[PDB]
């Protein structure tokens with residue numbers, strides 16, 4: 001089912017990343033100037049996107065790792081979309097703790113289409129096996145990396161974080177990408 | 182690319198319809214009791230979903246047909262999703278005019294994945310032809326109809342309106358489904 005992940009990666013770019021990435025740095029700048037706690041470090045630029053290859057996507061990031069704690073929302077982005085007046089795109093800011101201290105602050109989320117791969121593997125009517133799932137997750141990631149490599153909307157404002165579990169620290173994994181910038 | 186539309190229909194159910202359909206009638210009832218103009222007819226039950234087979238999805242419904250006019254928003258539905266705190270799902274209410282008079286009122290929108298099919302057909306990197314597009318749109322609709330036929334979340338709260346253009350009246354097409362209930 002090569003075309004499953006292919007379609008989902010295109011949909012994630014077309015219906016989301018291409019719409020929010022151009023306005024993201026402006027939203028982060030607005031937050032850093034007008035809303036961020038005066039005493040804290042600036043929110044990093046770039047949207048950090050988590051890509052668990054096992055497609056396990058909890059809705060609360062603190063459930064994946066206690067060292068990842070919700071801080072605040074960015075200013076919302078709204079726009080008329082497919083007949084929906086003022087559809088809302090929102091993103092959450094997280095602090096990343098290391099040794100109990102805040103080590104980084106960034107806009108962070110899971111890639112939601114991985115939830116579709118997971119659920120399709122669980123619904124009999126989808127005809128999608130658990131083995132198909134890992135292969136489709138990798139293909140989703142590869143397709144997305146290839147799109148963003150060529151996309152004009154991606155201008156050092158997006159970082160993909162793919163990982164697998166076999167102890168693994170998600171916060172440390174995000175900190176490693178953060179510290180690379 | 183059978184699997185393209187297959188994936189997109191599953192994603193539309195998993196990541197949207199299964200999440201909003203269970204709460205929709207409660208939201209419509211809330212609107213009809215607390216927000217609707219006292220002098221107007223009740224907002225119809227059911228989400229009406231437009232499926233233009235040519236995948237032409239304008240963002241403003243008035244552009245497709247002047248007799249479809251935005252009225253109001255339903256109360257928003259929010260929830261934590263894939264690391265996004267309080268992700269917002271919103272829906273718009275439209276009046277449908279006939280002979281200048283309001284003939285119906287309903288929650289109405291286009292199926293957004295049809296936008297992905299359209300854009301994939303325009304981007305060279307997607308490897309998706311314009312001919313592939315019509316066939317995938319039909320397959321998207323058939324797959325979605327089959328999912329919703331078996332879905333426990335769909336309890337006479339969703340109506341799919343598929344159509345093609347070869348004069349065609351969108352408002353009349355929606356009124357025909359409305360008057361069937």
Ligand SMILES: Nc1nc(=O)c2ncn([C@@H]3O[C@@H]4COP(=O)(O)O[C@H]5[C@@H](O)[C@H](n6cnc7c(N)ncnc76)O[C@@H]5COP(=O)(O)O[C@@H]3[C@@H]4O)c2[nH]1
Nearest residue numbers: 011012015016089112113192193196197269270271293294
């Ligand atoms: N993290 C995240 N935040 C968002 O606001 C968002 N919006 C879309 N997406 C994802 O991007 C891709 C393309 O979006 P599209 O609109 O074409 O399809 C969407 C859309 O048709 C519908 N849907 C989801 N939320 C809404 C909504 N608030 N209003 C209308 N439709 C919605 O159901 C499909 C799947 O939604 P998601 O399962 O969240 O994943 C989508 C998809 O992978 C999002 N991902």
